[model samples]
Target: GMPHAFKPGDLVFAKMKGYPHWPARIDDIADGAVKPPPNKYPIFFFGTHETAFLGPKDLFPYDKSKDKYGKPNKRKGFNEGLWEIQNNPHASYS
Candidate 1:
């Protein structure tokens, strides 16, 4: 697969659907921080304005909100760490 071309502050789309409130941003590229078995590409880190250190799986494209400032309201929930992909799926890694 072709490597994803993303730059800091670049707006990109993530297919994450768990949280519809918190927005995401491309924080940085994952060179070798995380490695999946039998795979080469490490997961990228996405930082949300409200949340931080979100995995690539927990990100999505930013949309224009109907709100005045185009900013979406923060959703109330557990402030746990962002989601991650393990074993080719959403799993814990530590």
Candidate 2:
């Protein structure tokens, strides 16, 4: 099995070759792609509203506790904080 796993609607931060890591939502798994390590996840960017394909190496699970970039101060905001419990399962924790 692959190391990292992501599915549709999962909040994540995706980084291109030179672009900064931006907040995005996993739209779906791209079929007909090369393989797991290759480009797989199809995601929707938040500010840009653009759909892009990214591989596992280019993605990291969104962590509101640390990467608080686009989140507004208003309460009861996006995703109802559902992603807080779903941390990156593939990350190495020391």
Candidate 3:
């Protein structure tokens, strides 16, 4: 499992929409400040959702960087929750 992006004490918003029961905490950031293996990556702790875990692709950027309490900027919409896995991590390659 990945380490969290936000700290334990840091405030975060739960991006709950259709399945409002799912709870999440923005635990840490993957800022690439650390070494490659343990590289900084945004980590979240999801609770009671059908899926056990989600990656960056599975989530939408809440863009709460300016907010005192990190709240989601917009609803992901109905079709935003789909998942697809591709090895291409680079924007130029993709």
Candidate 4:
């Protein structure tokens, strides 16, 4: 059995080899009961980019902190607080 389990519509993320930030929703999870199906991994869909059925080694739970792209995950407004406005004393807008 896998260490962690995910369900449909689950907000998940992955650290792609080249891409710095990547997050998506679990469209379908093929149970590996008597051995998983093709790719032997979950298939994420309705994503922002071309993030097809991603690999397991790169899959993980959605993290706002680690999500530097400010991309919206399954959970809307999840990154609302992640954005912080800084007003440096040395820097002036006007």
Better of 2 and 4 by TM-score: 2
Predictions ranked by lDDT, top down?
Answer: 2, 4, 1, 3
Q: Which prediction has more favorable TM-score, 1 or 4?
A: 4
Q: Candidate 4: minimum summed lDDT over ten consecutive residues — where?
A: 85-94
TM-scores of the models, in the given order?
0.32, 0.52, 0.23, 0.42
Give the backbone clash total of model 3. Answer: 11
Q: What is the C-alpha lDDT of each candidate?
A: 0.35, 0.56, 0.30, 0.43
Deviating ranges (above 4 Å) for candidate 1 = 1-3, 12-15, 29-32, 35-70, 77-94
Task: Rank candidates, TM-score, best first.
Answer: 2, 4, 1, 3
- Stretches off by above 4 angstroms in model 3 are 1-13, 33-43, 48-94
- Residue pairs in candidate 2 whose N, alpha carbon or C atoms collide under 3 angstroms: none
Model 4 alpha-carbon drift over 4 Å, by segment: 1-4, 29-39, 42-51, 63-94
Least accurate stretch of 10 residues (summed lDDT) in model 2?
85-94
Full-model lDDT, candidate 1: 0.35
> For model 1, which pairs clash?
13-61, 14-59, 14-60
Candidate number of the best lDDT: 2
Candidate 1 positional error at 24, Å: 1.7
> Residues 1-94, candidate 2, lDDT per residue (tens digit)?
6754777667776667655566666774458753333557776655453677778777777774335543443323223222332433222211
